Amino acid sequence: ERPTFYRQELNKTIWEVPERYQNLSPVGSGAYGSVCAAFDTKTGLRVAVKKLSRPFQSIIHAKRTYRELRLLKHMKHENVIGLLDVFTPARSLEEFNDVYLVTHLMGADLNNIVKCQKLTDDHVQFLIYQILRGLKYIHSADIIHRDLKPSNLAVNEDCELKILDFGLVATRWYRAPEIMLNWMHYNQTVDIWSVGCIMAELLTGRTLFPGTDHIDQLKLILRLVGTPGAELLKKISSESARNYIQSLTQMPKMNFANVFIGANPLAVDLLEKMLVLDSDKRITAAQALAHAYFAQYHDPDDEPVADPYDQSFESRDLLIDEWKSLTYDEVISFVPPP
Amino acid sequence: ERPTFYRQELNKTIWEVPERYQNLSPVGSGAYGSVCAAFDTKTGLRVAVKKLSRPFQSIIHAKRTYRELRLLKHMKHENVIGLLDVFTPARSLEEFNDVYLVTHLMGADLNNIVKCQKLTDDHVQFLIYQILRGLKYIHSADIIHRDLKPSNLAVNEDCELKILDFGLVATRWYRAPEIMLNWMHYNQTVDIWSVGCIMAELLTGRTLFPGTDHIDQLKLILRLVGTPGAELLKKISSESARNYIQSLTQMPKMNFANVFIGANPLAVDLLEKMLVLDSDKRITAAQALAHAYFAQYHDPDDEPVADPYDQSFESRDLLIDEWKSLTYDEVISFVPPP
Ligand SMILES: CC(C)Nc1nc2ccc(-c3ocnc3-c3ccccc3F)cc2s1
Ligand SMILES: CC(C)Nc1nc2ccc(-c3ocnc3-c3ccccc3F)cc2s1
Numbered sequence A, B: 001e002r003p004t005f006y007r008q009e010l011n012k013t014i015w016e017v018p019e020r021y022q023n024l025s026p027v028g029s030g031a032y033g034s035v036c037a038a039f040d041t042k043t044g045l046r047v048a049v050k051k052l053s054r055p056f057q058s059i060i061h062a063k064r065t066y067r068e069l070r071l072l073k074h075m076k077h078e079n080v081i082g083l084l085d086v087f088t089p090a091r092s093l094e095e096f097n098d099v100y101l102v103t104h105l106m107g108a109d110l111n112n113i114v115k116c117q118k119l120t121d122d123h124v125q126f127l128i129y130q131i132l133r134g135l136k137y138i139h140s141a142d143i144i145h146r147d148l149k150p151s152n153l154a155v156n157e158d159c160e161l162k163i164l165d166f167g168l169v170a171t172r173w174y175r176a177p178e179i180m181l182n183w184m185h186y187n188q189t190v191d192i193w194s195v196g197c198i199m200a201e202l203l204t205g206r207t208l209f210p211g212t213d214h215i216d217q218l219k220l221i222l223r224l225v226g227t228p229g230a231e232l233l234k235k236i237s238s239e240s241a242r243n244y245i246q247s248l249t250q251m252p253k254m255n256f257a258n259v260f261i262g263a264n265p266l267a268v269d270l271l272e273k274m275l276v277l278d279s280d281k282r283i284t285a286a287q288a289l290a291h292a293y294f295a296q297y298h299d300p301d302d303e304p305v306a307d308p309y310d311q312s313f314e315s316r317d318l319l320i321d322e323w324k325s326l327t328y329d330e331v332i333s334f335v336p337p338p
C-alpha cells in the first residue's frame, strides 16, 4: 500500500511527496503558508499541497497541528477547503515529524477578482450566496471564522468559491467592529459583518470601511450604521469602550439606499440586515440564504449543515509527544473521499 | 439596586447570600458540590443555591469556574438546569472571590426513583422522552455530556425532569464502552448509549451492565450487543484494543426481544437502535424523538435547539486574574429570566 515517495527541495525545505504528485511549484507568494501547486496523476486534477511547518517543535505547535488536521478532516462541504489527501514519508510513529495536506487548487482569491473591479449582480449574487452557504455549514459545527475576508475566499474560473482559510502583513476592514472589544466569546454573525463588507465591495468595487487604524475603523463604521443607542451601550462590558463611543459625536444611521445607489434594491435591503452594530440583531447565514437577493440560487434542500464537531480537545493540556501521536492517529485515520 | 446580604455558616463555610434567599440547608449529602436548598421569597419558589468552592485559587480553577458560569448561563431549555440567579457579596472586582449559582430545587434523581423499582411504560416513555429532549438541545450547541447517568438526571414529583449535571465515589455502567479507548473526540451518541442504559433500567428496574471493572464492563456489554465485526475493529485506533477484543471469545448479538420481555416492543426496537457498538450507527437524540415509543409525547414544533455556543475560550491560556475578571464580567452580565 505504502506509495513511492520522491524527495526534492522547495523553499529551503525538502518535500517528500508521493510520486503521484507531480509538478510541485510554490504559490500565493507566501500567503497561505508553505503551499505548493501540483498535478495529481491519480485524478488528473490540479492540486494544492501544503506542508505543515515544524509541526511538533513545541506544545503550542503540536496542538495547533492537531487542530488543523482536525478541522480540515471535518470540512466536507462544497464551499470549504476539504482534505483530498493527508500523507507522511514516515512509516512509524518514531519517524513521524511531517504532515502534508492536499486539496483542490483554485483560480484566485476574491481579491484578484474585485479590487477596483466591478462584476454582474448575478456574479455578486452567486459569489455572496456561496460565502453564506459555507458559513451556514461551518456555523453549525459551532465554528466561527472570526476573520473572513477576500484573502481567504477563493473562486475558480466558473465563479464557484471555497472558504479557503479558517477559523475555529495584511490589514482589517472586514472584521466585526466588536472584535476590537477583545471579548472572549462572540456571536457567529461576526462572520456576517465580514460578508456584508465583501458583498458591498463586490457591488461598489470599493472598500467599504478602509480604516487606517483601530480608531479610523470605528469612526468609518459608525459613520454609516449610526452611533450605538443606549440599550446597546449596556452590552459593552468595558467602561472605557462605553465612554469612548459616548465621548464621540453622535452620528445618525445613513440610508444604505443612498450609499449603494445604482445597485440592486434587494442587495441593499440585505446589506441593511448584515451591516448592523448589534451582532445579536444581525442575520444568521441560514437566514440570509432565504433572502430574496438569492432567490434564483436558493434551495433549502441543498444548503447542508456540518456534522457535529467535538472540539473538547482544546480544553486538554498534553505534552508534545502526546499531541504528536494524536495527529499521527489522525493521519493514519484519514479516509480520502470519492 | 445592590441587595441586602446576610452572612451565615454552612459546612465550614460562610455563606453571604442575599436576604431574599431564606432557609438555606445543605442537600445531596455532598454529591452536587456545595449546594444548599433555600426558599426564594421573591418568587416563593424552592431553590437550590450552589456556592462555587475556591473559584480562583489556581488557573485550573479560574478557567473551570469561568467554564461553569459560561455553560449554565447558556442552558436555557425546559429539561436542563438553568441559572435563575448569579450573585456575589463583593461590590468590586477587587472584592470578587466568590460566585453563587441559583436554579430550581428538584425532587430527587432517577436513582431514588427506579433502583429495584419499576414504573409505568407511560412514566418511562415520558422520562426517557425528556432525557432525549434535553440531549437534543445540548447536542446542538455542540455539547457532549460524556457521562450521563441517573445521578445527574433529576425529576420533580410530576415526572418532569431536568438534566442536572454536565458536561462539555460512584461507578460506571452508563458510560459508552468506547470511552474506555480514551479517544480525544467522540460521537455525541456516547450520550445516547447512556440513555439506553437508563431506559432499560427504568423498564427492567435492573442495572443493565453492572460491570465490576473495565474488563467486566466490556464483557457485560459485548455479551448482549455482540463482539465487534471486522470493518468495525478497523475503527479502533489502538492495536492493543483491537487485539484485546479479538483475543476474546466471539459472542453473538442477543435479541433484545428476549432480554427485555414483557416490556413494550416499541421500547425494545428503540433500545435496539441505541445500545449499539458503532457509535457512528447509533440514533441521534433528535432521531429517537420521532420514534414511535414517544408518539404520544412527540411534537416537532416543541423540541428546540440551543443557540450557538462559542467555546473558543477553552483554547485560551490566561492568568488567574484574567480568568477571574472574565467571570466577574460574566456575573455582572447575567440577566435573570422572566
Ligand atoms: C489562488 C491560487 C494560488 N490557488 C490556491 N488554491 C489554494 C487551495 C488551498 C490553499 C490552502 O490555503 C490554506 N490552507 C490551504 C490548504 C489546506 C489544505 C490542504 C492544502 C492546502 F494548500 C491555498 C490555495 S492558493
Ligand atoms: C457593543 C457595540 C456597540 N459594539 C462596539 N462598541 C465599541 C466601542 C469601542 C470600540 C473601539 O474601537 C476602537 N477603539 C475602541 C475603543 C475606544 C476606547 C476604549 C476601548 C476601545 F476598544 C469598538 C466597538 S464595537
Ligand SMILES: CC(C)Nc1nc2ccc(-c3ocnc3-c3ccccc3F)cc2s1
Binding pocket: B027, B028, B032, B033, B035, B036, B048, B049, B050, B072, B081, B082, B083, B101, B102, B103, B104, B105, B106, B107, B108, B109, B154, B164, B165
Ligand atoms: C434532589 C434534591 C436534592 N434536589 C436537587 N435539586 C438540585 C438542583 C441543582 C443542583 C445542582 O447540581 C449541580 N449543579 C447544581 C446547581 C447548578 C446551578 C445552580 C445551583 C445548583 F445547585 C443540585 C440539586 S439537588
Ligand SMILES: CC(C)Nc1nc2ccc(-c3ocnc3-c3ccccc3F)cc2s1
Binding pocket: B177, B178, B179, B180, B181, B214, B215, B218, B228, B232, B233, B235, B236, B240, B241, B242, B244, B245, B277, B278
Ligand atoms: C470501536 C468499538 C468496537 N468500541 C470499543 N472497542 C473496545 C475495545 C476494547 C475496550 C476495552 O475495554 C476494557 N478494556 C479494554 C481494553 C483492553 C485491552 C487494551 C486496551 C483496552 F482499552 C473497549 C472498547 S469499546
